Amino acid sequence: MTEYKLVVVGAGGVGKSALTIQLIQNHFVDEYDPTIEDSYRKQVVIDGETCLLDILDTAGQEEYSAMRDQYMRTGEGFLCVFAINNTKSFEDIHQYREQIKRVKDSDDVPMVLVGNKCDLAARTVESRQAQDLARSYGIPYIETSAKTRQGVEDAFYTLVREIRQH
Template sequence: MPLILAAMTTNSTNNRPHNCNKNHTVKEYKLVVVGGGGVGKSALTIQFIQSHFVDEYDPTIEDSYRKQVAIDNEVALLDILDTAGQEEYSAMREQYMRTGEGFLLVYSVIERESFNELSTFYQQILRVKDTDDVPIVLVGNKSDLTEERSVSYEEGEKLAKQFNCEFLETSAKQGINVDQAFHDLVRKIRAKNESITNTVSSRQSSTLGNDNKAGLKQDAQGTGSNVGGGAGQRVGGSSTTATGGDAGQRAKQQSSSNAPKTESSGGCCIIM
């Protein structure tokens, strides 16, 4: 099983190599190239890794490659697995799919059968990953063989819409869209990871906000209870005092009107 480690690519802007900061960990992405036999999966991968076209067909069982590149000014280490297209390796392919983060789903534009069997590969990916949110780029390879084409560009676009994924045609022989296919797949993985991070952060913020609101509500209820109790006591006290005063005044007025005029203090006994 060949393992190829390609040198770091250079910055096309200033022609200086991308040096990794010692304190910065380079993000690694696990890419899996999937498709039928003879569609050019290995040719695509080697063209991307070595800028070299392999025109001999040698059925792949499993080849692994690594390459460090800069995508959108961010250095990435790509771990690329080129899988077997033959049906007898289906179980082995599933094992690779479990570890893959993103998938290049490849067919040949000159082989209708390779296009028709894509749904099988697609469903296998979703089943193994147990989700329909999987970064996938649909690739129609051998686009340079225009006279032999049997699958139109429009058919590829339509299938990509069904798969809810990106689509492009490539030519491993001429190097057309080869880099873009791998780079776009990394971008899709990054977008998914960012979406997951944002969702988690949003949920944490929402939970924290709800906890704070609950705490403030409890504090407000406790304060309101104390204030209400004091006011009630004061109001009740004032009310009692006022009522008692009025009753006293009425009692005095009644006793004054009913009591006979006398110079003696025995008037109190008359009241009783």
């Protein structure tokens, strides 16, 4: 079996769980229950390949983030998520990327930058800004809405396609 281990990281509240639950379970989580560490598994066909996705949904709240680094170690690719209406979460991305590089002991780790909540209009991070950040990291930028499902499959499948290039 072909298994891809994906890890979703980013600031508290950006929509990591809502994204993962939309992908796996096809509904939108409206309430906010902070995550400690949850895992999901699903068999899917991606570009003609039957594979198993193992997705680790991590804590964004500092308080709930005990041993996050330990969980992240096994990850093969990382979704670095911020929210387009949360400037601080975007500024935080650098820190999440650095943590990933530390945990993996590599500067060559498959990643995708994700700007979530694109259904909302209080945008404070413009597409071009996020494109520029992604470009500096050598990775794709994709916008998503866990609410409408826009971009969700694309974000996760793009991460698999990045893992395949490494």
